[PDB]
């Protein structure tokens with residue numbers, strides 16, 4: 133029993149972390165096989181972060197302008213290339229600690245573990261979600277760029293995030309491991325508005341199912357709703373629309389608990405109307421939206 | 434910016450986890466140097482001395498991945514089994530065994546069949562339980578802190594209590610709390626809130642720009658402790674005040690000034706507001722956890 137914000141064990145990722153220095157900029161890189169991946173803005177100066185011409189800056193660099201440190205060992209850079217907003221440094225050594233891995237681009241609502249690192253060394257591991265507005269609510273200080281997000285379903289590491297910047301509201305933006313930003317963001321210091329964030333409805337329902345599995349029934353009611361009436365109400369609380377895909381996805385937790393998906397929707401509608409009235413669900417006084425249907429089945433079964 | 438429930442990096446501990454099988458019971462062991470540690474209840478179907486006498490070394494199946502370890506010795510220490518093996522763990526980190534106090538936090542590496550499955554942060558509750566997340570097969574999962582490349586092992590998981598909270602031992606097999614490794618009736622005591630940790634988390638909030646709950650008021654240790662008692666909060670000691678000293682100095686909010694904030698929150702509630710995305714007063718971050726996370730301390 134119990135229900136925690138549970139991260140993946142970080143060891144497979146810790147053995148991939150290195151420090152990358154170009155100029156006076158030091159940040160983290162990810163060493164897989166004979167390639168180090170890091171944010172391309174490691175090549176930028178103070179005098180040019182508004183409108184950097186990355187192609188013009190990179191052509192001016194030598195392999196020897198990149199200092200790559202794995203523990204107290206310098207790796208030899210024998211080549212460099214840019215893929216979207218990630219820099220790929222070819223190095224003379226394959227990482228002997230390279231795990232089984234893949235690169236996956238995730239959808240809003242998906243969860244992943246972050247290993248927050250400084251100077252190529254890990255500080256901590258925590259759980260995050262890709263917000264509907266394509267930010268993440270991370271915990272990152274200066275130096276954390278090149279920290280990664282990952283899942284480890286079944287001994288294979290799925291890299292899904294690389295950290296690049298903090299927005300003025302204190303939330304975070306970054307790329308997949310192909311260097312494509314999540315959301316409308318660019319690696320420039322120009323002003324860039326994050327969309328209004330919304331609550332991940334399918335995740336809140338998954339968590340209510342986790343609560344029932346763990347023996348909490350207080351918030352259930354005798355009512356049902358149509359999907360369309362649910363979405364009309366939930367939109368008024370800045371909840372994401374629930375789609376038929378989401379209803380299908382909740383089918384197995386519905387089967388395990390014997391509570392129909394649109395019956396649980398009616399419970400959520402009442403909780404938005406009433407609040408908790410001094411009660412808690414799985415030790416929270418708020419409706420939690422950073423557990424996916426898959427995360428609930430992983431932790432509860 | 435940002436403030437998350439952050440665990441220690443788990444890599445040093447992942448390389449120590451093994452599967453222990455005795456008869457029909459499979460659970461987790463911790464492999465350090467040439468010894469595997471696990472709950473003594475692995476030998477059960479209790480008179481532990483007697484049950485153990487009847488076991489030869491080959492009764493204990495220890496697997497480190499798909500490699501069998503050879504057991505050459507077995508002894509009991511309190512409620513832990515120590516299995517001597519013929520090979521030292523070449524992945525043994527710098528470590529020590531420590532016994533923590535109620536209110537102290539640590540990371541749990543939840544494991545099944547000797548395989549790490551997840552990591553989370555929790556606190557030893559004032560009632561000596563932990564609010565963990567554990568299914569059948571999780572016994573022998575361990576809790577730990579890291580302090581500059583040294584792993585301090587503090588917890589080994591033994592059982593779930595009827596309310597769904599968890600009980601276990603230090604790595605010398607001494608239970609936290611008034612629990613026994615027996616199928617008899619046992620209950621979590623009334624729990625209380627870890628006051629010094631709530632104050633640390635309000636400092637984390639202020640560092641992260643969440644300031645609405647701050648007020649002009651200050652209090653006394655004596656006046657606040659009468660309010661703490663009233664709200665089933667642990668007493669705040671002068672040592673706790675001294676421990677929050679760095680956060681007082683960094684934020685400009687003295688501890689008894691923050692206590693007057695906490696009094697108002699206990700008396701009044703949060704009036705529809707949140708702190709660091711919580712509608713509850715969070716008590717599973719220590720002062721050291723807040724300094725750690727907000728200053729970017731790393732592990733070697």
Ligand SMILES: *[C@](O)(C(=O)NC1CC1)[C@H](CCC)NC(=O)[C@@H]1[C@H]2CCC[C@H]2CN1C(=O)[C@@H](NC(=O)[C@@H](NC(=O)c1cnccn1)C1CCCCC1)C(C)(C)C
Nearest residue numbers: 158159173274275276277296297298299300319320321324
């Ligand atoms: C990272 O590269 C790093 O760890 N570097 C090691 C120390 C040497 C670093 C992480 C900093 C917290 N990231 C950055 O420096 C990035 C790079 C890459 C893209 C832009 C630059 C600047 N930057 C930032 O994260 C900045 N963020 C911003 O400038 C945002 N704007 C504001 O925060 C802001 C605040 N008040 C008024 C006006 N603007 C913008 C917002 C829109 C998207 C782009 C970033 C700082 C300010 C350094 C956090």
Ligand SMILES: [Cl-]
Nearest residue numbers: 237238239242
């Ligand atoms: Cl996805």
Ligand SMILES: [Cl-]
Nearest residue numbers: 137258437438
């Ligand atoms: Cl969290």
